[PDB]
Design a protein around this nucleic acid. Structure first.
Lengths: 388, 121, 255, 241
RNA sequence: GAGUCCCAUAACCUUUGUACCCCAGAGUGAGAAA
RNA sequence: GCGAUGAUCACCCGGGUGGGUACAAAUGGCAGUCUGACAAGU
């Protein structure tokens, strides 16, 4: 006695009309079980009448939650109203086949004239629609049922877990891999700036060993022949004259064995030196982002030891969750290769490891961690410090 | 809803602490949260007992994640003061674990509690 | 003359290789770090620079609806990223996060811009220190050949056979000591002329091109009054092309 | 044993998608979908292939019951490359990640979990593996997540519940294809600790037949586990006779 | 005539230089102080 | 005015030898740059 069938797709709601009713008493017979698999036989049973796709991803998640709780959405109420014919509440009622029994009572309240069936006979028809899927839609634009499930699957799952970006700590792991990487490349490229400008005027490579000081000076002193008292004051402003280099560069610029390089060659040195200047500036910007981000993610661990040290500890564990799950002993050897936590010296190291473990647990399993416990935990370490 | 969950009732806590004390005498009890984590890693724990008033409660909330990954029963008792006293040590104990041993004298009591904890979960 | 010093070439080629390594690592991580926000981009757009430019034009998947990627991507690629944006599995990021990811992306395009600048710089250097060699083998392969020997003069004094197998010492000396066949391309394999050849002709063109490369190279190194024109290279190039044409014209199959 | 610097020989296993790493000791390994990281700290093997660096992950039998089944010599494993697998009781990526490797990019894995704490890492893992769809929902009510799952070639269940037979039957009826696979992990203690393990295993097999699932083979997981067995069956809607 | 395709754009060994290290490691687990 | 939120647990003469981890450099070593007159067409 089934006349209409409701199927919920990730893309939308699909309503079918049952043309022929399959045998009821012989439901368990093999041949009626096979016809569900065979599309040629199945298409004789049901036909698609309506399909109302969801407006977008946001609507799909809302209706998935409503369907999960056995509720009727405003979209579902619309499609059923458009299709199902009006019938008496008592004398005769239109029959609708639904997958979920919990959804049955809700549909009855909205539509008193429709009777919901979810017995085994209904399940078989629902199984067949799920089995053939898009083939029954007669080409109607149902997108792709496999891609929408993946997006909706992640959406539905995280909504129940209340997964948030605030808990996210992978931003910390990447930025460490940036900071040490930037330091290596800044040093590497800075050294190359020395050699290229070393050919033109080698003596400067001796004058101001500080690597970042060369580039700004090399950006200024492009050609050693250019030597003016005003320029001397300008380069004197760069850094300080206490070292006396401002006078030395002018003197050595007057007397040096450096071979003059071409204008194009100098164009590269300043440009290559300019690149090194940007990376150091970016590296400082990122290091500040790490300081801020760590306080948000792991305030207890950050306060106890420091933002950078805690981040390296998190990366070595692979995740803040991994660090929390490790025992106190494992954490101590986690930072025993870089001496992060470093006979009496070892005792403080082992003691600090235990405190760091507890600080991570508070950070890891708290929705909005505070630094109140990290501060007292560090203070407890401070009291331990003078005692030994 | 509360982070410490499930919390044993008064009747069950009394039974749990009985097993904890007898385990302490028979050297089948590991005391402290750090010990509990190790036993879970070695997979040598009948079940884990934790204190629900640990200050803060978060410093032992790693153990439930380890346990239910390993399918080990766990339960929270209201008092760390009582748990330490039952454990047999002169300090409060926030977490303890019963070691796996099929040759123990208190096998029946341990499995008796373990079945109850499983029903609670 | 400041424009005829070869140590710039050896430094430039070494630097150019290092830049390729560094730019790659930053790009992989921009894919991972921004992929956290939107993991589907890396499969659609593989190019690092094109990937980075997308982050600059649009920061967030919401922006994908209105942002236009026409100048970065063709019509079919640009629509695909838009569709992935709404069905994206990624999380939302704060403007604090977006600022630093944009900062990383800006470094990608800047490095890509400068890598082009260094490549053009090396081309200018190679066309003034060895214009004849560049006409025959090319700026890139020619620079590596000079860098391998360490100096233009050192390469000039090497016979043509060595230049053919200059970059394959590992296979050469293994084969020589174990009485097996030796390599036949070396570093010259990546020359354009060798690419045009096919089958066994590649070995023949390498022998022909290496012989002419020594002719054009020695003129660059040892000519007191060389004109910066590449005339010896151009005429040397014509001979190899003629050799390739008749070499490729022949058909082994009976007609 | 299997130390860092040691070298091993990788060869294919009888089951598609599973490999053996030979040497002084043999290791069951699976090709890494997301190279360069370990989900639960397992050892990894790298091979230089013309050259791209492919990686392989060691499958620990003592941690995954499915791996214990492969070690014990299961004749048929419906989990294979390019197949959809519904994983019930997916606590975390200890076993789901390896199953994701076997199915490969073409296949998918619907990981179902109830507890929110293990689920959060299941989300974190799944974002590395595009073929995994984590469903944080109770396996007791498949009607809640019917929107999220299509038909699946095989159903793998590691749920440790006393009425898992009801859970398997409901999920199989909704999502398992006819003639599809069912792989069950049964722990005697969880179902009924009052009776011996053999009585439990015989009783569970009877329930599966009642639910139109034909058992094909049974295997006990010793020495890796005690009182554990894996039952492999086929979902024969038409008839089991 | 002849292995680019096992990174000679490299690996390994040695010397030198710089910075740290000389307790257990799936570390142990109820003593310490008097 | 303690503690399971964790107590306890190489050599030689102030000086020199021995061992270990990481990175950089070497115009330091392995380490020695293939053959040599025919080929293709009617």
């Amino acid at each position: 006695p089934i006349e209409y069938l409701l199927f919920e797709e990730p893309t939308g709601y699909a309503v079918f009309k049952v043309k022929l009713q399959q045998d009821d008493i012989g439901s368990r017979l093999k041949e009626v079980q096979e016809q569900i698999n065979d599309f040629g036989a199945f298409t004789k049973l049901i036909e698609l009448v309506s399909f109302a796709p969801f407006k977008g991803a946001a609507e799909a998640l809302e209706n998935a939650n409503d369907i999960s709780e056995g509720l009727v959405s405003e979209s579902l109420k619309a499609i059923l109203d458009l299709n199902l014919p009006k019938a008496s509440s008592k004398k005769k009622n239109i029959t609708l086949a639904i997958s979920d029994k919990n959804l049955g009572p809700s549909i009855k309240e909205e539509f008193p004239y429709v009777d919901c069936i979810s017995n085994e006979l209904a399940q078989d028809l629902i199984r067949g629609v799920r089995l053939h899927g898009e083939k029954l839609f007669k080409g109607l634009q149902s997108g792709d049922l496999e891609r929408a499930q993946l997006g909706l699957g992640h959406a539905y799952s995280r909504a129940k877990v209340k997964f948030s970006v605030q808990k996210n700590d992978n931003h910390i792991i990447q930025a460490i891999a940036l900071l040490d990487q930037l330091d290596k490349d800044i040093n590497t490229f800075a050294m190359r700036v020395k050699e290229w400008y070393g050919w033109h005027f080698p003596e400067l490579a001796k004058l101001v060993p500080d690597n970042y000081t060369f580039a700004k000076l090399v950006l200024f002193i492009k050609d050693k022949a250019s030597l003016n008292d005003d320029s001397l004051h300008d380069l004197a402003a760069l850094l300080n004259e206490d070292s006396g280099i401002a006078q030395r560069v002018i003197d050595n610029a007057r007397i040096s064995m450096g071979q003059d390089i071409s204008e194009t060659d100098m164009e590269n040195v300043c440009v290559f030196a300019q690149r090194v200047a940007s990376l150091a500036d970016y590296r400082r910007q990122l290091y500040d982002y790490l300081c801020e981000k760590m306080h948000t993610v792991a305030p207890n661990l950050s306060e106890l030891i420091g933002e950078v040290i805690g981040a390296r500890l998190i990366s070595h564990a692979g995740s803040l969750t991994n660090l929390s799950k490790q025992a106190a002993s494992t954490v101590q050897i986690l930072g025993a290769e870089k001496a992060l936590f470093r006979k009496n010296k070892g005792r403080i190291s082992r003691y600090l490891a235990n405190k760091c473990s507890m600080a991570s647990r508070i950070d890891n399993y708290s929705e909005e961690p505070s630094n109140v416990f990290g501060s007292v935990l560090k203070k407890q370490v401070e009291q331990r410090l003078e005692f030994y | 809803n509360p982070k410490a969950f499930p919390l044993a009732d008064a009747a069950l806590t009394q039974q749990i602490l009985d097993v904890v004390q007898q385990a302490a005498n028979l050297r089948q009890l590991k005391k402290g949260a750090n010990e509990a984590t190790k036993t879970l890693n070695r997979g040598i724990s009948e079940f884990i007992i934790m204190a629900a008033d640990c200050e803060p409660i978060e410093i032992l909330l790693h153990l439930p994640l380890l346990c239910e990954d390993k399918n080990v029963p766990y339960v929270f008792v209201p008092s760390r003061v009582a748990l330490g006293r039952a454990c047999g040590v002169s300090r409060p104990v926030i977490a303890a674990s019963i070691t796996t041993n099929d040759a123990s004298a208190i096998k029946t009591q341990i499995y008796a509690v373990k079945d109850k904890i499983e029903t609670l979960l | 003359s400041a424009d005829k010093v070869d140590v710039m070439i050896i430094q430039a080629i070494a630097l150019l290789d290092d830049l390729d390594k560094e730019l790659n690592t930053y790009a992989m991580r921009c894919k991972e770090w921004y992929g956290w926000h939107f993991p589907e981009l890396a499969k659609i757009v593989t190019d690092s620079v094109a990937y980075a430019r997308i982050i600059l034009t649009m920061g967030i998947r919401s922006k994908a609806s209105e942002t236009d990627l026409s100048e970065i991507l063709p019509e079919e690629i640009e629509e695909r990223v838009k569709t992935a944006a709404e069905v994206s599995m990624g999380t939302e990021i704060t403007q604090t996060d977006l600022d630093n990811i944009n900062a990383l992306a800006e470094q990608i395009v800047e490095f890509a811009a400068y890598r082009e600048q260094l490549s053009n710089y090396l081309s200018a250097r190679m066309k003034a220190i060895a214009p004849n060699l560049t006409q025959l083998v090319g700026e890139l392969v020619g620079a590596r050949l000079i860098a391998h020997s360490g100096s233009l003069i050192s390469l000039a004094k090497s016979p043509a056979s060595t230049i053919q197998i200059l970059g394959a010492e590992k296979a050469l000396f293994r084969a020589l000591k174990t009485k097996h066949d030796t390599p036949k391309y070396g570093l010259l394999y990546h020359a354009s002329l060798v690419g045009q050849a096919t089958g066994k002709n590649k070995g023949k063109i390498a022998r022909v091109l290496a012989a002419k490369a020594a002719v054009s190279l020695r003129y660059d190194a040892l000519a007191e009054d060389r004109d910066d024109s590449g005339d010896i290279g151009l005429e040397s190039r014509a001979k190899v092309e003629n050799r390739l044409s008749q070499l490729e014209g022949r058909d082994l199959r009976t007609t | 044993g299997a130390r860092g610097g040691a070298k091993v020989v990788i060869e294919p296993h009888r089951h598609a998608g599973v490999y053996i790493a030979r040497g002084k000791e043999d290791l069951l390994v699976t090709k890494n979908m997301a190279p360069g990281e370990s989900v639960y700290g397992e050892k990894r093997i790298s091979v230089e292939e013309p050259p791209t660096k492919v990686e392989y992950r060691v499958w620990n039998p003592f941690r995954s019951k499915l791996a214990a089944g492969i070690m014990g010599g299961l004749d048929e494993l419906f989990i294979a490359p390019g197949k959809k697998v519904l994983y019930l009781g997916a606590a975390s990526g200890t076993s789901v990640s390896h199953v994701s490797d076997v199915v490969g990019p073409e296949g998918v894995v619907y990981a179902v979990e109830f507890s929110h704490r293990p689920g959060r890492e299941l989300i974190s893992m799944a974002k590395k593996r595009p073929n995994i769809i984590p469903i944080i929902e109770d396996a007791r009510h498949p009607q809640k997540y019917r929107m999220l799952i299509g038909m699946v070639d095989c159903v793998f269940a590691d749920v440790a519940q006393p009425d898992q037979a009801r859970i398997i039957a409901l999920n199989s009826h909704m999502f398992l294809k006819d003639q599809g696979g069912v792989v069950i992990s049964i722990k005697a203690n969880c179902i009924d600790s009052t009776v011996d393990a053999e009585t439990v295993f015989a009783r569970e097999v009877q329930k599966l037949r009642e639910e139109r699932i034909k058992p094909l083979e049974q295997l006990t997981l010793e020495p890796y586990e005690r009182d554990h067995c894996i039952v492999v069956g086929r979902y024969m809607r038409s008839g089991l006779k």
